[PDB]
Structure formats: structure tokens, C-alpha cells
Write a protein that binds this DNA or RNA. Structure first.
Ligand SMILES: [Cl-]
Ligand SMILES: [Cl-]
Ligand SMILES: [Mn+2]
Ligand SMILES: [Mn+2]
Ligand SMILES: [Mn+2]
Ligand SMILES: [Mn+2]
Ligand SMILES: [Mn+2]
Ligand SMILES: [Mn+2]
Ligand SMILES: [Mn+2]
Ligand SMILES: [Mn+2]
Ligand SMILES: [Mn+2]
Ligand SMILES: [Mn+2]
Ligand SMILES: [Mn+2]
Lengths: 77, 110, 96, 91, 93, 105, 84, 99
DNA sequence: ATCAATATCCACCTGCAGATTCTACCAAAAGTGTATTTGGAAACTGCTCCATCAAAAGGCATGTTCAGCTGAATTCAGCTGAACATGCCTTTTGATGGAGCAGTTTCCAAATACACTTTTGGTAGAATCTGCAGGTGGATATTGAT
DNA sequence: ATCAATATCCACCTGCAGATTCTACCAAAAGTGTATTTGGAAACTGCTCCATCAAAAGGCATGTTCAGCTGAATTCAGCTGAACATGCCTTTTGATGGAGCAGTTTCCAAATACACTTTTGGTAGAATCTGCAGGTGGATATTGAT
């Protein structure tokens, strides 16, 4: 499913980052990075979720996971 | 016993808009075992919060009127915060829907 | 037939996506990825849509910032093309 | 019934820009911001009280928290506004 | 006056894992800082968990979730095992 | 006759003391269950044992009896999980040797 | 009543900076590094010390303790082990 | 009979191995104490310090500078140099989120 | 580097779907009055450390010479990545049930708190016990001039 | 491609700084009894997600062409390292007052507790208001020909 993060989507992200020219190896590399990132946040989110004995991951669970990893997010509280 | 003195909220007595009583209760619920909260502590907290809210709303409303629109958006909040040295240092959180402040490094322009 | 020279459309894209704020990843593949990842942690998980949306805002802000740092590393080496060694240097200095 | 800071944020907005409104998503961001700063100040005030082996969080703890957590000029102005508020509240 | 520390317990554990080894006072100071650090991380996250789920008691359940949150991978698995063992042995009395 | 809670839990770390400390760092009117202190003690004891195991290994591969800050640093920075858990400065611990390949003569 | 303290950032000598770079695995050092390093160090120290003194003044002491420095370092994300 | 000379860089690498194998502090101790007091007294006059506070400050400063040099060296090598330059420090600190 | 040709960007427009704001009710929270307690400030004072000064020798900083070799500057080809036409499929969008969790209320057995009392595990400082820092010298490895 | 010079590696050594034990008390852990709280089991109930189904457009996959950027190659001036003379200031330990933390006791200003009243903030629907989808026309920018 990681391949659903397509090359044009990665390029748009790089463009918002001010990147002008992109090596062909970037896309696979970026997917790897994203995968790690996502795992960590999700690992903590579901942890909060099983502590509450729920079966639905809430926005609050995600926000707490991101704050606990030093990546606070505003606007979903 | 005909007349009571009119009730004045602690917010109004301190000249604040932010809710002193509510903040006092939250402060008591963040204190340790046997913890106390002083009379003026919630008033000070309320004033700090109101001041910082006023600063970001000021800058974001400036960006809002300099874009010929009524409502402050996440975009305006992000522009205001990232464009202010102190606010940018105080607020490192992600502002969802705010994007980035436009910038292209000089060596990339044709 | 008209042709832009290599780099003109790229810079146009930079200005376009830096003045906008919408999400840049398609929603269904990202939601599919989120659920696949979550299923190696707890079975029959459900998600509020706002949980998926918060995750996508976080991931996209993270990747944009990473690309800013990667670009600084590429520029440092007197290049304009970002390469994996640029990502790797940025992530090492970040402590990732 | 969920609490929020929206009505007070809107009051402050109408004070600084009487003509301007705010979108609900920006109001959500302001709420996250207010809650964030509040738990930073409370955490540090509680820690200050405990380092010096006290149980009361007083406005003095809040002031030192503000000096610790806020950058430079902001901290100065914040310390002023808080002091002003307290002086008007006790009068 | 009497300032408490974790030194005697650190030394007992040392003798359990390396019966032959000692420890310098500055390394003991590092160990004391480490134990206090991990204790405040656990206690902070356990009180937060209690408040998110609106319980007023910090129970072993809050401690276990805190450990899963704060510890990497294998460390967490093994820590959860030791904690569970201690709790079941304490209640068996 | 008094039986220590540490002994009751089969631990070396002090369960009662840790209970008092937990009780003095939770929210106002907060209560702490006994087994919360037993679990916390077990966690701290396990992490101490893990760090000490690695540090004594480094100490014994350097032919000395006593663990020093240096051995703690070699032990923590040499294990990826401990390294990621402990970001603090180890006073007196120095650095793990490393010279990048492009610098050697 | 001590002698006036002036210009002590220059006491971070070029050999001391070089030894630090060496522990950092650095083999060759431009001549401009030393001043740059002094600048960086000074900012770092200012920030840490500014917080330590804040803790000291809150406690109504006139002695900066090791705990105050430890708390200031923790508040700046540079936790230190071995002094409290 | 010519006097012995090591080639440029041989002693540098020897110094790297020496100071990476050791743990002593590398800044002289009294000049660092003077620096700490000069800075602290421009915040509040006639402060005193415990000896351990000054030593904790020095451990932190030296750990910070060693780390900064590790990253700066990564930046210099990244640009195919062996010499660290100010732009390397500035790039490291920018990516660190400092300044 | 001024043209003529071509392409994109960026204001401005309207009409209406939907977002903001307004309005009214009502649990819950804030405020008041009154009584009662208590954390910590103030004032002592003992007594640690802290600031400063002192001595003297050598470890180390400084300033200089000189040349190896690094960074910087320049050229350029091949090979990668940008741009674009084309055409196909994944995502998007809109709708519909209903399955299955959350959220809420109630309610005791079970858990935790707290005063008082007994008892000992844990600490400070002294007294013992002993690694290991440095000091020294010979084997081995590395280095740089021939 | 054989050595002299110099460093490194690696045993061996001992005295005293520091690691470990011993000693005497006492702060706090544990036991008991009694009071108070609460976690969670039980039983509901709308309302969010999930599953399914469907059409179609725009966003993506692909293949082609070529421009230009990256990496390699080459030259060289001057910058930084290595080595050394010189001499100062850092290091280590002790003294000396005394500043200022700690420890202790007392007593209010300041905080909590509790009953009751007043007020407010959240919610949902109505009433307003506004950005936004597209479309257009002019501003601006790029590209190739001289
Ligand atoms: Cl690469
Ligand atoms: Cl530079
Ligand atoms: Mn001064
Ligand atoms: Mn009484
Ligand atoms: Mn009292
Ligand atoms: Mn000299
Ligand atoms: Mn070169
Ligand atoms: Mn070509
Ligand atoms: Mn005993
Ligand atoms: Mn030795
Ligand atoms: Mn109202
Ligand atoms: Mn309009
Ligand atoms: Mn449009």
C-alpha cells in the first residue's frame, strides 16, 4: 500500500518544500521515511486506544501520540 | 435583607475576558496531592493567556485585512506566527491547513 | 510546438504549492496505508475520519519540513537536485 | 457538554479587530494553542512549587513560569499584563 | 539532614548481575539521575492517562500503558513481563 | 510481624518509598494503588539491571573492577534501545570512537 | 570585590576548541571556526545561565546550585546526568 | 640529517584517537569558571555558585560542543571537504533548529 | 536584447450552498456568606561551604616559520531528470443500511485513605579495605625519508 | 621498497584516593482499625463508522526527446598543520572570615469547606452572510528569432 503514495504526490510535497530538482531514488527513500514516521505515531495512538478499552482510534489518540513524540498538532482537539 | 450586592465575576473584577473561575478549577486539577491554588494565580494565568491570544489574533487579523477578507483562517494564523520571531520560537506546533511561508532559495531562481 | 525549458515548470510548481494549503496526498491510498499499518498493532480497529485527517496533516507537515532540510543539504553541496544522501544527512543531524 | 475557549477568543478578537471574524478551523487552532500554553505554564508552575518544597501554586510561581517559558519581549509584556490584572483584582 | 537516594538498590542489583564488579561514586550519581528521570517520565504519563480517561486512581494499568508509551520495543516487552510478574506475586500473598 | 512490600513483590527496589513518591506526584486528590507502586518499582529495577549488565560487560572487557561513567556511556551508546531511551548527557562519559573513512590517511 | 571580569570568552582558547573538535572527530579546521565557536558557546551559556538564575531567584537564594543548573538544562532539552 | 616531520594530518588523526579514547574535560577549568561568573553577574550581581554548579555547566557546554562538531564534520564531509568551515556549523545549527 | 507569439497567473465577477453568527433554554458551574484551618513567612541561629588570597613549578598557551596539500576555480560530456502528449484506471463522489461501539446512569464490593502505633530499613559519618592511576620500559606497528 | 624515528600496545609495579563496610540512630514503612471513594459490571441507546454499490473525470502511468546538471578531471595559490622557543598562568591545596543556607518555632494571612443562589456557556436550529467554483480579461513572464 506504500506504493499508493505516488511519485506526483511526493513531488508536490517536495515542491512545497521549495525543491527544484528531484533524483529518481528520492521517491522510494521518501516512502521508507514516511513508513517509519507513520508506524511510530500509530503505535502510540492505538496504545492510548487500548488503554481506554476502545476499538475506534480517535483524533485525540492521534494528537496525544504526536505530542508525546514532540510533534504537537493544532486544530483537532 | 432586601438587597444583595450584585455578583461580579472574577474575570470582570480583574478586567479580563478569559474565564478566571474555570482556569482556577483547571489549575486545582493540575496540582499534586494536597496542592493549593492561590487567589491571584488563576487571574495571572488568565491574563497571560489573554495577552498571548491577543498578540496572535492581532497579527493574524492584520494578515486577514491585508488580504481583503473577513475571517481569519489557519493560513493567516500560520503566516502571522511564522513571520514573528518570538511567536515562531514560542509556537513550534503544526498548524493544520496553514501551509508554509513562501520562499525559494536564491540559487534556484533562473 | 511550445516547450518550456527544464526548470521553469518546476519553479512554477514551487510557487503554486507554497501559496496553497490543501493536502497533497490522495485520501484513499493514505487511509488504506494507515489501516494497514494499524492492523499489525490491534485487530478490527476503527478510525474516526478526523483521526485519519490528523495523521495526514502530521505526515505531510513532517515531509515538507524534511524536504526543506534536505534541500539545504543539497544546496550546501553546490547542487540543486536532492538525493538520498541529502535526506540521510538531514535525518542524522535531526537525531532521527 | 464540552468546554472550549471559543467565546473568549472571539471576545478578544472583537477587541483587537472589531470588523474581523474567525473560521471554525482557525478557532480550533486557537483552542489548541490556548490549551497548549496553559498546560506548559501549569506544569512548570507545579514543578517550581515542588522544587522549593511547597504545595501552593501562587501567582509568583506563574510569573516565574512565564519568565522561563516565554521568549524575551513577550515574557516582559506578559508579566506586565498579569501584574496589572492582579492589581485590579485585589483592589 | 537525610537525603534519600537509590544507591543501595542500584548496588544490590549490580551485585546480582555482576557479583564481581563495583561502581564508582560518579557512576552511581549517573545511575541515580537515570532512575529519577525514568520515574518522572512514568509518573507524568500515568497521571496524564488517568486524566484523559477520567479515573482518579493511578493503578498498575496506568503504569503499564506508560511503560509501553515510553519504552522502545524489546525493552517494553521485557519490562511489562517483570512488572506483571511482580504484581501477580505481590497479590498472591 | 512486618513484611516489606519489596520482599512481598520479590523486588530489590523499595515499593513503599516509591508508593509515597507516586502519591506525591499525581493530580490533586489523586490516589495510587499499591500495585501501581509494585509495577513501577519492578520497571525501575529492570531498567537498572539492563544498564548495569551492559556497563559491567564493558568494564570487564577493559579489565577493571569498577563501573565508571565511561563504561556507562559505552554501554548506553552501544545499545540502540538504551541509546534511544536515554538522550541525556552522561557527565564524564566522553564519546564512542569513530573516524569517518574519508579522513584516514 | 573581585577584580572586574571582562572578556572571558577569550579564555576558550584555540587549543581547547581544537581538542573539542578532535573529540568530535574533526581532522582539519578553518581559521574562522574559533570565533564562530566562541559565539555559539556564548549563546548556549547565556541561555542556560539565564534559566538557572531564574530558578535561583525564585527560591530566594543568592547561590546558584547544581540543581538549578540541572533544571535549566532539562528545561532546554539538554538533560544532564550525574549532578542530581 | 634532516629533522623528523609528520605529514600534515598524521598528528591530527593521532589527536582524534587520543581525545576520543579519553573522557577528561578539555577547556581549562579556571577560565571557564571566570566565563560563567562574568555571564551570571550580568544577570544578577554578586551571585555565588556551588562548585558543582560550575562543573555541571562545563560538562553540558563540552557535550554540546562535541556534538555540534560531530554534525559540522558530517556537513563538511557531505560537501566533499575534510575542513570544517563556518558554513558547516551554520548548516548544522539550522537543521538542529537552533539560532 | 527589442520583437512577436504563446502560456500562465491573478484579479474580479456572480449566485448559491454552506459556514458563521444569532437566539433561547437550562444543567452545571461560578459566586457569596460564613466558618474554620493551616502552609509557609518571619524571625531566629548554627554552621557549612563559598570567595578570595597565597605559593610555586611545570603544563600548556602563544606566536612564529615554512611547506604540503586542500579548497577553489574551471572545463565539459554523458547521462539523468524535466517536460509533454496520450490514454487508461484509481480515486472521488454520492447514497444506503445496519452493525456495533461510545457514552451515560446506577450501584456496590472492593479498593484506597488516614490516625495512631510499633518497628526496622536506610542514612550520615567514621573506619577499613584496596583498585587503579599513573609511572616505567620493552615488543610491535606505523610513518616518512630514501 | 630497505631503514631510522617515533608512537603505540601491553604487561608490570605500588600508595593513597576512593570504594566498601561498619556503626548508631531515627524517619518512615508497615500493621490495625475505621471511614470514604471509586472502578467497573450491567444494561441500555442513538449515532458514527463500515460495507457495499455505482458512474465518470481528472489525476496518474507510460514513453519519448533533449537540455542541462552533475561528476570527473586538472591546475595552483595560499591556508592551515607540524614543530619549536619562550614564559606565563593554571593547578592544587590551605587559610580565613563570614555570607547565607538550613534547621526550628510561632502565628496569621491565606487557603479550604460547605450550603445555597445566581449566572453562564454549550447546544441546536434559525437567520445571515460569505467564500468559492468557474468563467473572463488583462498583467506578467517565458521562449525563440535576429
Ligand atoms: Cl544518494
Ligand atoms: Cl564558511
Ligand atoms: Mn559584567
Ligand atoms: Mn479544630
Ligand atoms: Mn502548620
Ligand atoms: Mn608566551
Ligand atoms: Mn581537493
Ligand atoms: Mn549534450
Ligand atoms: Mn536495623
Ligand atoms: Mn594505566
Ligand atoms: Mn450566555
Ligand atoms: Mn463575497
Ligand atoms: Mn477559482
Amino acid at each position: 500500500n506504500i506504493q499508493g503514495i505516488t511519485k506526483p504526490a511526493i513531488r508536490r510535497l517536495a515542491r512545497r518544500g521549495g525543491v527544484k530538482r528531484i533524483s529518481g531514488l528520492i521517491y522510494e527513500e521518501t516512502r521508507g521515511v514516511l513508513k517509519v514516521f507513520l508506524e511510530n505515531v500509530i503505535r502510540d495512538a492505538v496504545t492510548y486506544t487500548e488503554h481506554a478499552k476502545r476499538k475506534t482510534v480517535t483524533a485525540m489518540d492521534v494528537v496525544y501520540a504526536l505530542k508525546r513524540q514532540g510533534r504537537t498538532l493544532y486544530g483537532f482537539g | 435583607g432586601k438587597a444583595k450586592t450584585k455578583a461580579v465575576s472574577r474575570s470582570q473584577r480583574a478586567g479580563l475576558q478569559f474565564p478566571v473561575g474555570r482556569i482556577h478549577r483547571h489549575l486545582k486539577s493540575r496540582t499534586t496531592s494536597h496542592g493549593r491554588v492561590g487567589a491571584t494565580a488563576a487571574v495571572y494565568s488568565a491574563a497571560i493567556l489573554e495577552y498571548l491570544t491577543a498578540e496572535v489574533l492581532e497579527l493574524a487579523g492584520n494578515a486577514s485585512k491585508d488580504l481583503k477578507v473577513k475571517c481569519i483562517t489557519p493560513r493567516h494564523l500560520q503566516l502571522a506566527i511564522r513571520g514573528d520571531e518570538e511567536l515562531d520560537s514560542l509556537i513550534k506546533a503544526t498548524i493544520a491547513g496553514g501551509g508554509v511561508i513562501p520562499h525559494i532559495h536564491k540559487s534556484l531562481i533562473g | 510546438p511550445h516547450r518550456y525549458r527544464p526548470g521553469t515548470v518546476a519553479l512554477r510548481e514551487i510557487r503554486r504549492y507554497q501559496k496553497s494549503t490543501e493536502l497533497l496526498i490522495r485520501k484513499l491510498p493514505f487511509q488504506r496505508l494507515v489501516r494497514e499499518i494499524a492492523q499489525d498493532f490491534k485487530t478490527d480497529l476503527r478510525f474516526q475520519s478526523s483521526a485519519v485527517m490528523a495523521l495526514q496533516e502530521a505526515c505531510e507537515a513532517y515531509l515538507v519540513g524534511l524536504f526543506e532540510d534536505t534541500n539545504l543539504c543539497a544546496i550546501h553541496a553546490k547542487r540543486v537536485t536532492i538525493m538520498p544522501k541529502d535526506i540521510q544527512l538531514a535525518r542524522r543531524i535531526r537525531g532521527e | 457538554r464540552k468546554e472550549s475557549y471559543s467565546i473568549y477568543v472571539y471576545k478578544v478578537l472583537k477587541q483587537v479587530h472589531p470588523d474581523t471574524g474567525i473560521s471554525s478551523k482557525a478557532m480550533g487552532i486557537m483552542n489548541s494553542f490556548v490549551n497548549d500554553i496553559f498546560e506548559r505554564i501549569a506544569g512548570e508552575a507545579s514543578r517550581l512549587a515542588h522544587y522549593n518544597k511547597r504545595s501552593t501554586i501562587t501567582s509568583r510561581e506563574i510569573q516565574t513560569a512565564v519568565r522561563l517559558l516565554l521568549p524575551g519581549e513577550l515574557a516582559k509584556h506578559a508579566v506586565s499584563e498579569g501584574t496589572k490584572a492582579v492589581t485590579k483584582y485585589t483592589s
